Amino acid sequence: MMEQVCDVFDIYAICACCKVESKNEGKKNEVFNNYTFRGLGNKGVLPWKCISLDMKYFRAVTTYVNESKYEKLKYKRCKYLNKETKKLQNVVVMGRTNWESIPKKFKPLSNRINVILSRTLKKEDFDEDVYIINKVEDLIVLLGKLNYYKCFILGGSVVYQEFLEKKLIKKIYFTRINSTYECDVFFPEINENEYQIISVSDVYTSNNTTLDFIIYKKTNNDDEEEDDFVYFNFNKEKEEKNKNSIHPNDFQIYNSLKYKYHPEYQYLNIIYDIMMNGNKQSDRTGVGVLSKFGYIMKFDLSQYFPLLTTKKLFLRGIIEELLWFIRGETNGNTLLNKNVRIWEANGTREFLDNRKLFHREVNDLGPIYGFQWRHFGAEYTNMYDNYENKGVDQLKNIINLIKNDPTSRRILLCAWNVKDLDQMALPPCHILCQFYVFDGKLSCIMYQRSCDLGLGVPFNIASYSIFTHMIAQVCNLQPAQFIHVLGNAHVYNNHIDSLKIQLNRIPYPFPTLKLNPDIKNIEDFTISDFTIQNYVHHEKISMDMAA
Amino acid sequence: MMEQVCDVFDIYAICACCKVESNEVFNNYTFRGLGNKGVLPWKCISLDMKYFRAVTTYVNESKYEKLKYKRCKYLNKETVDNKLQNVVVMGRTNWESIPKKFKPLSNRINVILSRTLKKEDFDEDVYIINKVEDLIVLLGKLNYYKCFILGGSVVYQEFLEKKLIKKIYFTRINSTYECDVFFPEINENEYQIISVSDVYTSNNTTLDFIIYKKTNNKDDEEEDDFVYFNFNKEKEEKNKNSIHPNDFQIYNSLKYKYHPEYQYLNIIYDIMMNGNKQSDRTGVGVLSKFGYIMKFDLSQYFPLLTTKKLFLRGIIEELLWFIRGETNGNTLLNKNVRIWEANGTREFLDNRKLFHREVNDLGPIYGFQWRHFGAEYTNMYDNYENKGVDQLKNIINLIKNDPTSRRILLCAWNVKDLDQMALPPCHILCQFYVFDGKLSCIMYQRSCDLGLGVPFNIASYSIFTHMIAQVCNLQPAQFIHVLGNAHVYNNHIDSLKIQLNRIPYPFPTLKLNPDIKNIEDFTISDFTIQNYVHHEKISMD
Numbered sequence A: 001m002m003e004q005v006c007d008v009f010d011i012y013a014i015c016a017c018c019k020v021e022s023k024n025e026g027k028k029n030e031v032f033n034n035y036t037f038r039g040l041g042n043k044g045v046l047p048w049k050c051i052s053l054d055m056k057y058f059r060a061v062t063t064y065v066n067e068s069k070y071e072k073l074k075y076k077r078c079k080y081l082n083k084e085t086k087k088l089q090n091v092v093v094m095g096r097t098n099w100e101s102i103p104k105k106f107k108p109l110s111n112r113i114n115v116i117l118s119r120t121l122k123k124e125d126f127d128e129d130v131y132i133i134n135k136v137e138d139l140i141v142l143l144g145k146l147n148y149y150k151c152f153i154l155g156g157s158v159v160y161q162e163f164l165e166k167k168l169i170k171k172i173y174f175t176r177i178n179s180t181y182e183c184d185v186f187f188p189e190i191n192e193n194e195y196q197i198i199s200v201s202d203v204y205t206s207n208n209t210t211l212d213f214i215i216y217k218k219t220n221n222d223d224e225e226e227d228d229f230v231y232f233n234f235n236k237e238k239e240e241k242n243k244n245s246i247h248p249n250d251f252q253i254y255n256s257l258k259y260k261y262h263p264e265y266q267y268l269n270i271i272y273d274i275m276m277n278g279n280k281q282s283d284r285t286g287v288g289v290l291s292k293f294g295y296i297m298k299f300d301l302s303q304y305f306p307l308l309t310t311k312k313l314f315l316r317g318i319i320e321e322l323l324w325f326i327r328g329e330t331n332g333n334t335l336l337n338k339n340v341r342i343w344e345a346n347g348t349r350e351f352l353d354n355r356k357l358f359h360r361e362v363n364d365l366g367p368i369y370g371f372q373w374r375h376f377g378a379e380y381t382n383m384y385d386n387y388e389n390k391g392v393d394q395l396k397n398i399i400n401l402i403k404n405d406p407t408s409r410r411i412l413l414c415a416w417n418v419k420d421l422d423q424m425a426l427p428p429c430h431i432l433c434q435f436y437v438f439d440g441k442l443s444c445i446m447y448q449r450s451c452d453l454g455l456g457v458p459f460n461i462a463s464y465s466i467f468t469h470m471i472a473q474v475c476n477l478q479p480a481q482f483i484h485v486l487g488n489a490h491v492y493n494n495h496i497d498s499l500k501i502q503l504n505r506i507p508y509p510f511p512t513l514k515l516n517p518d519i520k521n522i523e524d525f526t527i528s529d530f531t532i533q534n535y536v537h538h539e540k541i542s543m544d545m546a547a
Numbered sequence B: 001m002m003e004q005v006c007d008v009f010d011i012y013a014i015c016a017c018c019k020v021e022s023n024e025v026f027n028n029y030t031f032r033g034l035g036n037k038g039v040l041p042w043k044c045i046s047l048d049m050k051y052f053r054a055v056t057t058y059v060n061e062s063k064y065e066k067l068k069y070k071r072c073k074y075l076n077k078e079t080v081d082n083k084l085q086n087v088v089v090m091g092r093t094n095w096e097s098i099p100k101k102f103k104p105l106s107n108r109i110n111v112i113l114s115r116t117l118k119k120e121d122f123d124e125d126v127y128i129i130n131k132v133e134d135l136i137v138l139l140g141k142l143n144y145y146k147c148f149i150l151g152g153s154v155v156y157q158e159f160l161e162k163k164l165i166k167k168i169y170f171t172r173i174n175s176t177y178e179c180d181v182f183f184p185e186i187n188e189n190e191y192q193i194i195s196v197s198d199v200y201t202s203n204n205t206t207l208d209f210i211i212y213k214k215t216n217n218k219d220d221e222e223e224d225d226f227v228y229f230n231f232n233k234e235k236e237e238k239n240k241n242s243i244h245p246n247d248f249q250i251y252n253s254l255k256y257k258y259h260p261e262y263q264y265l266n267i268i269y270d271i272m273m274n275g276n277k278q279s280d281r282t283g284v285g286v287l288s289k290f291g292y293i294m295k296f297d298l299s300q301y302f303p304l305l306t307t308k309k310l311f312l313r314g315i316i317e318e319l320l321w322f323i324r325g326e327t328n329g330n331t332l333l334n335k336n337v338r339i340w341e342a343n344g345t346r347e348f349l350d351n352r353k354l355f356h357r358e359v360n361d362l363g364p365i366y367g368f369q370w371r372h373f374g375a376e377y378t379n380m381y382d383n384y385e386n387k388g389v390d391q392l393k394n395i396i397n398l399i400k401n402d403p404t405s406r407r408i409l410l411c412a413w414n415v416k417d418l419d420q421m422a423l424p425p426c427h428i429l430c431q432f433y434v435f436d437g438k439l440s441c442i443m444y445q446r447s448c449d450l451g452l453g454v455p456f457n458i459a460s461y462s463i464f465t466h467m468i469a470q471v472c473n474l475q476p477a478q479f480i481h482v483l484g485n486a487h488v489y490n491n492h493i494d495s496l497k498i499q500l501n502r503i504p505y506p507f508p509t510l511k512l513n514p515d516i517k518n519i520e521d522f523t524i525s526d527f528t529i530q531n532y533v534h535h536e537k538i539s540m541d
């Protein structure tokens, strides 16, 4: 290498970008890409009032130093300048407008060497402990004279534009604010060939927005204990086959990422695991799956709504399904009249006949979820019957227990009624929900005996997440964790190519779910009581690719 | 001038010890069998052999310079002497004991402590020595990564006596053999264990690998990226219970905790550090968390906890009682199995509003749901033959006829019958999975008393997996344990703190009488545990 200025001087950019108005931004038919998050500023200030978690991120990154790693950095810089060889601090560079946007109580930025770029102002115009430079070149001369750890370009847009076009940035630390505000300055459109995303953080809520932290990297375009690790892996040739192979190069992006901390990676990593280590099994008439047995996902509903972003999902159907369940309905026609076709195939004359339900009316699904939720143990007759005060009203029971016996270890909703399995159109995939209450917070475990990772699971995650919110609210609690246990976890072979596409997509910050807060009984919700805010997602995928 | 010679020249011992012939008390000295009649005590353990090969062969050429620099400084020298391999040192008996076809040991500087024979009869690359002192001389003049003392007894004895050993790479063979020669008693004060491997089956024995270390008293680009993602972690606020982790010195002093028993101990450590303080229906406190998974590989071991003593006659009798479909508490009481006694008292049933239920009539619990799900429960004496759904019969038929079915569940949580039960089932369901003639089992437990309950529960369902596997001509693969409400009783904490500071032993094995091929034909005599090496019993209360 002919060492580059950005690598010698460790020059990084840090920014936060929200989404922008854009003539309503198309409206619902909207395309999303990394350029969706581009809003920097409005009227010489930030577009948002306070996002404290971003502020705390920005301070920790820009203040953090590692003394032991100075030796190697001084040598490199001294070598580069062909030269021989206080508390160590980072340098932070601000345009004059950026500097003027910062309230006085914050500046100069604590535990940091403050640098301001200006032509109009000179050192005589500042009271503060700051360096003025009038030239990008004077910054590089200055880093050559100073003891510092890393150099952070803090914006604004004009400063971002010139440091990027000069190829002076080695990584961009980029906050995605997943909300829309009025903006009049924007971050430069990043060239996907110059910079690639290498890391994605967990998703958080701060001040009524979700947000995450991504890292772009510029492209090329007691030691003793370490050996004991090698020894303990003398037998790792069984997972070194990765039985199925499916080729490395099909996951360049997935495998390129260094930190994969976005909760959507719980889903994508299970799909990777099944693709590389799954067992080949028969399924039905030849169809074919890769299968594994026993996974757990955990989703923090206090921080986000885990609606998958690596493809497009609609929730109207699965919400109409959940309301249908809560009503205790088994009538397929109710959903079909709402153009929800989830249960259509399971209600046909042929499907019911092949289940031996010869005496069952078309779209009479029998004693499935709804009936077990409101009437477990009652004799199923038909889908029109009035089952009032027949069987156990489980739903009512668990709402009572959450409200009056919250430390109970017996708050389960169970759909797997052994007596009734053969009368069901098909037995339930979603066996039981158990609830947990601590400190005014409701968590839900859902055990799923059979899990179609390609099609079913993304919707099942959404269903039980919404359900946790509904139970949390009618019992006066805040939603905490939704915990999803996978028994038979499988990828249909038909889905494999579609999933390969999806695995190489980078998740977006999750949306948020809003419930009408006036709804105080589980029975009183209707479709318009549910709102998904700030859903940023990749393009729709048909998992079939054929029909 | 404060540097051990052992640290300079990097002298490690590597041994394999089985158990020896004669309630038994176990300790690290339990495992001391080395040899028998100038030969290994056992026919052939291919996994110990494989481990041996790798550890003694392996070098890191990128880490040698730092070694050559501390070494040549020490000898009051500067240069190499006046492809990097390791050094391997054998006693003469140890040297002869090897079948010729292994000698000299591939890719290794073979040495031989022999006061008797000399260079004469042997090539170059095969050094010989008269004293221990003359080994240091030869390492002083050599290019070698690390020096491994390969035994035998006399050699370990005198190398350990002369404080010359930096670490002991110690294989525990968990079977008994006839033996002439033994490893010395390793002083708990001289040495300490810093690492425990996974447990393995090789040649009809379980074994693990542990590391003793001599006691000290007696791209960084993405290294910073890692710290940025921790910007929002709680430091001492998230370690939010003052259980005082410095009471777990042993637990926290181990580097590598790969023994499957750590799946249990780590969950206890987690609920102690991060658990939520709650009341419960007994009124004693708990620390509780929600949602864990443990997986045990039944093909390699029987996961009976070793960090305390467990008894299994009672839990097997419970299981056989379930399989029979019994709900009669008295059957168990008359066999001195008292698991369900408290749940069958007049006072307990009355407080459960079961005023019309006879003592020790537990109602439609496990056994009744497994063999009669949906039948109308009358009393514990009624004949229920061919009433309700025989789930146990059904899961076995599905395993044999439809093994790729995703509907092989055994469910005890009969919502209709809960109020009639002495108490609702803690063990909600079992799901089964068949691949390549191998049976795995998930058991979902809604309520988990770590400490008293869960250790038994692992054993119960591990045994059941073996029984269903046998009668379906399958091999057991994984038992997978999902914990919903996972709690440590505050009255258990002092006892668990003692337990976490104990190092597991290699697991035992379960042998079933192999003639049994119908789930109903098992009897208590059909179950044996082999090679159960355990720490002292603990009263959890």
Ligand SMILES: NC(=O)C1=CN([C@@H]2O[C@H](COP(=O)(O)OP(=O)(O)OC[C@H]3O[C@@H](n4cnc5c(N)ncnc54)[C@H](OP(=O)(O)O)[C@@H]3O)[C@@H](O)[C@H]2O)C=CC1
Pocket: A014, A015, A016, A017, A039, A040, A041, A042, A043, A044, A045, A046, A047, A094, A095, A096, A097, A098, A099, A101, A117, A118, A119, A120, A121, A133, A134, A135, A136, A154, A155, A156, A157, A158, A159, A160, A162, A185
């Ligand atoms: N969301 C985020 O992460 C961030 C948002 N912001 C916001 O961005 C906006 C500010 O951005 P913007 O308007 O582009 O202005 P900048 O903050 O980029 O500052 C521009 C000014 O800096 C000086 N300058 C820049 N480059 C040079 C140079 N090479 N040599 C000499 N002087 C130079 C000039 O000062 P002069 O005119 O005095 O010569 C120039 O007018 C505000 O809304 C602020 O709130 C800012 C940083 C980060």
Ligand SMILES: NC(=O)C1=CN([C@@H]2O[C@H](COP(=O)(O)OP(=O)(O)OC[C@H]3O[C@@H](n4cnc5c(N)ncnc54)[C@H](OP(=O)(O)O)[C@@H]3O)[C@@H](O)[C@H]2O)C=CC1
Pocket: B014, B015, B016, B017, B033, B034, B035, B036, B037, B038, B039, B040, B090, B091, B092, B093, B094, B095, B097, B113, B114, B115, B116, B117, B129, B130, B131, B132, B150, B151, B152, B153, B154, B155, B156, B158, B181
């Ligand atoms: N379990 C394990 O990991 C291992 C077990 N073994 C087993 O142990 C037995 C071998 O142990 P053991 O019988 O005690 O024999 P050793 O292998 O310890 O060899 C003893 C002989 O080595 C020589 N020797 C010992 N000390 C010195 C010294 N200080 N200076 C010069 N020569 C020395 C002498 O041979 P001479 O009289 O010729 O000078 C001595 O009689 C066998 O049954 C073998 O299979 C062996 C290796 C590993």
Ligand SMILES: CC1(C)N=C(N)N=C(N)N1OCCCOc1ccc(F)cc1Cl
Pocket: A014, A015, A016, A046, A054, A055, A058, A098, A101, A102, A103, A106, A153, A154, A155, A173, A174, A175
């Ligand atoms: C937006 C922000 C702070 N976050 C990220 N990720 N990257 C940045 N470059 N940022 O801007 C740094 C300069 C602006 O500073 C402030 C503005 C308003 C204040 F009230 C206080 C401050 Cl300190």
Ligand SMILES: CC1(C)N=C(N)N=C(N)N1OCCCOc1ccc(F)cc1Cl
Pocket: B014, B015, B016, B040, B048, B049, B052, B094, B097, B098, B099, B102, B149, B150, B151, B169, B171
């Ligand atoms: C027991 C053993 C092999 N394993 C461990 N962990 N530590 C040791 N010191 N070992 O002994 C090494 C010398 C013995 O070598 C052989 C004996 C018989 C053979 F047929 C082949 C060989 Cl190589």
Ligand SMILES: O=c1ccn([C@H]2C[C@H](O)[C@@H](COP(=O)(O)O)O2)c(=O)[nH]1
Pocket: A426, A427, A429, A450, A451, A452, A453, A455, A456, A457, A460, B406, B407
């Ligand atoms: O909500 C649902 C319903 C169904 N399935 C999938 C799992 C299996 O692929 C199939 C059910 O088939 P059985 O396991 O019942 O055979 O449907 C889901 O993933 N989620």
Ligand SMILES: O=c1ccn([C@H]2C[C@H](O)[C@@H](COP(=O)(O)O)O2)c(=O)[nH]1
Pocket: A409, A410, B281, B423, B424, B426, B447, B448, B449, B450, B452, B453, B454, B457
């Ligand atoms: O095999 C068993 C039976 C019971 N329990 C524990 C869980 C709780 O500590 C208690 C059951 O009481 P409830 O959770 O149902 O209140 O018994 C176990 O851990 N294992």
